Amino acid sequence: MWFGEFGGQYVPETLIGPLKELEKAYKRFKDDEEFNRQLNYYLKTWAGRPTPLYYAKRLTEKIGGAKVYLKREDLVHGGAHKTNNAIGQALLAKFMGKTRLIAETGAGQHGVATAMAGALLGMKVDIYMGAEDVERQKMNVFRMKLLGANVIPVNSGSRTLKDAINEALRDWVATFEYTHYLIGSVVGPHPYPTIVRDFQSVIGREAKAQILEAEGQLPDVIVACVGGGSNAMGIFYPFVNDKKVKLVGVEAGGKGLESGKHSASLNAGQVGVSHGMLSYFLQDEEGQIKPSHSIAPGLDYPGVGPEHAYLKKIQRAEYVAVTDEEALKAFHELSRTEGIIPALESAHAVAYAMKLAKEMSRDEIIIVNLSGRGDKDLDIVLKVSGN
Amino acid sequence: MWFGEFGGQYVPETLIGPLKELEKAYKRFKDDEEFNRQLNYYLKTWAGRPTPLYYAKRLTEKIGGAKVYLKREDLVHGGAHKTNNAIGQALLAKFMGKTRLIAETGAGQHGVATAMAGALLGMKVDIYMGAEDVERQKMNVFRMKLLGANVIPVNSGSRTLKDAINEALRDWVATFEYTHYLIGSVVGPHPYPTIVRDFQSVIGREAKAQILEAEGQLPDVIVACVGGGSNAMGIFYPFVNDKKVKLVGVEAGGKGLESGKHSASLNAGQVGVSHGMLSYFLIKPSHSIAPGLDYPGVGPEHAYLKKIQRAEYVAVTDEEALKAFHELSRTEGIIPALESAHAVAYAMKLAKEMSRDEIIIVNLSGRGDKDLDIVLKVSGNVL
Numbered sequence: 001m002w003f004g005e006f007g008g009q010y011v012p013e014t015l016i017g018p019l020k021e022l023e024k025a026y027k028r029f030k031d032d033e034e035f036n037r038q039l040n041y042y043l044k045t046w047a048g049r050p051t052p053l054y055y056a057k058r059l060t061e062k063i064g065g066a067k068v069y070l071k072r073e074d075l076v077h078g079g080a081h082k083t084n085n086a087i088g089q090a091l092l093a094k095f096m097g098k099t100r101l102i103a104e105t106g107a108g109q110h111g112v113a114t115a116m117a118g119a120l121l122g123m124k125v126d127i128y129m130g131a132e133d134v135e136r137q138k139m140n141v142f143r144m145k146l147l148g149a150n151v152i153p154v155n156s157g158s159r160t161l162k163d164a165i166n167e168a169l170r171d172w173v174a175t176f177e178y179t180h181y182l183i184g185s186v187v188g189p190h191p192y193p194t195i196v197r198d199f200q201s202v203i204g205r206e207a208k209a210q211i212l213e214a215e216g217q218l219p220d221v222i223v224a225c226v227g228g229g230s231n232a233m234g235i236f237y238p239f240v241n242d243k244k245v246k247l248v249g250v251e252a253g254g255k256g257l258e259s260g261k262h263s264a265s266l267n268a269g270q271v272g273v274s275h276g277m278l279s280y281f282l283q284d285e286e287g288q289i290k291p292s293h294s295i296a297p298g299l300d301y302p303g304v305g306p307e308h309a310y311l312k313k314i315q316r317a318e319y320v321a322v323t324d325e326e327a328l329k330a331f332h333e334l335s336r337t338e339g340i341i342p343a344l345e346s347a348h349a350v351a352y353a354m355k356l357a358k359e360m361s362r363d364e365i366i367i368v369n370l371s372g373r374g375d376k377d378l379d380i381v382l383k384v385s386g387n
Numbered sequence: 388m389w390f391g392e393f394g395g396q397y398v399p400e401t402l403i404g405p406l407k408e409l410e411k412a413y414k415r416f417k418d419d420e421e422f423n424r425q426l427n428y429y430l431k432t433w434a435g436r437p438t439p440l441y442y443a444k445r446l447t448e449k450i451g452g453a454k455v456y457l458k459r460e461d462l463v464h465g466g467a468h469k470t471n472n473a474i475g476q477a478l479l480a481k482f483m484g485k486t487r488l489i490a491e492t493g494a495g496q497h498g499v500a501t502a503m504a505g506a507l508l509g510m511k512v513d514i515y516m517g518a519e520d521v522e523r524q525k526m527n528v529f530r531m532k533l534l535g536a537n538v539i540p541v542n543s544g545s546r547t548l549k550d551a552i553n554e555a556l557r558d559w560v561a562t563f564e565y566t567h568y569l570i571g572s573v574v575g576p577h578p579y580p581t582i583v584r585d586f587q588s589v590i591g592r593e594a595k596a597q598i599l600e601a602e603g604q605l606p607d608v609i610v611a612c613v614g615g616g617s618n619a620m621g622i623f624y625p626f627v628n629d630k631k632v633k634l635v636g637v638e639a640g641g642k643g644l645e646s647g648k649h650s651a652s653l654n655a656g657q658v659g660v661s662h663g664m665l666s667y668f669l670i671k672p673s674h675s676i677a678p679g680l681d682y683p684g685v686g687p688e689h690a691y692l693k694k695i696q697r698a699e700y701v702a703v704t705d706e707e708a709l710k711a712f713h714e715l716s717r718t719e720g721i722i723p724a725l726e727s728a729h730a731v732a733y734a735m736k737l738a739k740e741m742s743r744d745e746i747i748i749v750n751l752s753g754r755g756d757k758d759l760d761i762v763l764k765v766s767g768n769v770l
């Protein structure tokens with residue numbers, strides 16, 4: 001349950017049993033033949049795995065430095081890497097005999113992934129969402145309802161993701177016997193940070209095989225955006241024991257790191273406890289988590305995974321930040337240059353990789369995790385960038 | 388250059404020279420080792436081919452008849468099958484030494500795919516689009532511009548696809564030396580209907596292999612929606628010589644066949660010569676809830692198929708397609724394109740009658756993200 005000093009299970013006693021039962025079922029099923037057969041089957045036929053690894057030749061040559069490859073999680077069913085975890089946990093829940101899934105969501109993206117996986121496996125889905133987020137994500141809320149999920153607006157507290165998490169936790173205490181709490185990033189009490197990372201590591205395993213086929217060697221740098229940290233852990237984890245492979249996580253710089261309007265928890269946060277985990281959080285004088293900002297809706301998780309805090313501490317991975325403006329420019333640039341519209345979240349990784357590529361030599365290789373597609377962000381970009 | 392009587396090359400001598408060069412290019416490259424290498428590489432790494440063949444277990448069990456499989460073209464880069472054709476023609480153009488692509492569009496869906504493909508290969512892209520359609524498709528227009536293409540609204544006359552076609556053709560006459568005209572369905576003069584069907588036939592080849600792998604036998608029925616007819620021909624074509632395999636093309640019934648607001652060219656059209664080809668045309672205003680099913684014409688090869696009775700052609704209404712849209716989302720967690728929902732709707736009706744040993748493949752031509760605003764507007768109008 002610990003990654004160095006980060007992680008743990010900081011929850012009330014009523015949740016210890018349910019977390020124990022989940023940990024027990026996961027230890028059994030994670031290496032179970034039938035479970036992995038079905039999981040790999042759903043991932044192949046329904047999700048469309050494997051996703052390709054694409055060499056961005058025009059972008060590479062335009063920048064004039066290192067080769068830039070894109071791991072195309074944007075092509076997974078639903079348009080984002082979140083599906084990998086949603087299927088894994090939903091199937092796990094079915095194997096544990098649960099009939100219902102609950103989840104929280106801020107951007108709505110995890111809510112959608114959860115609703116998709118629940119519909120697939122024939123399970124009831126309830127999604128807790130802060131009323132302020134509900135208001136701003138009307139199409140995601142509609143998507144969830146199309147998928148047969150029930151969206152429950154959370155009106156308490158600040159009507160945001162933090163408040164939804166608290167409601168979801170309260171629901172699970174009472175309903176855990178038939179309900180699985182499907183956490184959407186590498187966060188929360190153990191064993192969630194481990195489970196989510198395990199279910200996303202397929203990205204890194206495919207990427208490793210794909211890059212070896214393409215270039216006959218491991219990459220020099222892997223770059224991924226970091227909200228809660230799941231897409232980054234997914235692509236990082238199989239390369240952790242490859243000492244030569246540099247790992248860079250990109251947080252939301254928002255309006256700027258000194259502006260006080262960003263979501264760079266590792267970069268500017270402090271150690272604290274929330275959502276059952278000891279990790280880095282941006283918190284106020286009174287210890288309360290403060291509002292995070294980013295143009296990218298999905299980089300709004302309040303905090304960061306304990307495994308990322310650990311990788312930072314031991315200096316296995318480096319963490320940087322990219323601003324809203326920089327992310328936007330990358331969003332336009334990739335669309336024009338390679339014909340791929342990325343998610344605004346993923347654009348942060350693209351933005352940094354472009355800066356990094358310029359510094360590196362042409363024989364060198366950068367893999368960017370393109371965690372999602374940008375169809376969902378077109379309304380946003382039109383408003384901000386203009387017609 | 389013909390499919391029975393249908394097809395052909397009915398154009399002025401201004402267009403004959405560039406088409407002839409296109410065939411010499413296509414014949415040279417269609418089977419060329421280098422062209423096929425690069426095409427397959429882009430289809431794999433950029434488009435994400437192959438797409439899986441998915442067994443809709445819950446939907447199959449619910450209906451209680453035939454096994455329903457979905458060929459998941461919704462998973463191709465861009466969320467639609469059109470990408471397969473866009474990459475093929477754009478690559479051909481680069482091989483021919485062209486630096487620019489032009490195309491027409493109504494829904495905007497083919498315009499987006501051309502912009503994507505053109506961006507991929509570093510070509511200038513100009514999309515001609517009718518002004519009435521430009522105003523109806525704000526997000527697709529924005530997409531095209533974001534992808535680096537220029538959208539040329541046609542404000543003269545009818546302001547529809549018909550006018551966009553005319554302007555694009557005029558453009559190609561002047562600029563074919565450095566410009567390739569990229570047609571978006573199995574329509575127009577030779578060699579376009581053949582070329583587009585060729586570039587989409589990968590759908591059927593994957594599907595054939597995938598169904599043999601899954602079930603050890605060919606399917607009893609293949610169902611696909613029909614606008615211009617590219618996704619249906621793509622999946623149909625590799626099974627044409629396998630005689631026990633029924634082929635069904637599903638047209639837009641719209642408000643109703645009796646209502647006169649639909650796009651069912653084969654069911655209610657008349658034979659005519661348009662877009663430089665002999666085929667079925669309605670011209671009249673076509674209507675459908677699914678934007679991509681707007682084309683009043685239909686591919687000549689579907690004309691050829693209907694006359695010899697090799698494929699059957701049917702229609703599904705706006706209301707039925709909407710029902711299937713909701714049904715597939717809730718039952719399989721797959722939100723289909725409204726075009727594709729026409730096929731799903733018909734396949735569901737068809738499954739009920741058939742036995743449990745029997746197999747249906749539905750071509751899920753696209754994803755429904757693009758249609759959510761439309762469906763929200765209608766869904767919010769329910770009582």
Ligand code: NA
Pocket residue numbers: 226227228263264265299300301302303304
């Ligand atoms: Na954060």
Ligand code: NA
Pocket residue numbers: 613614615650651652653680681682683684685
């Ligand atoms: Na038609």
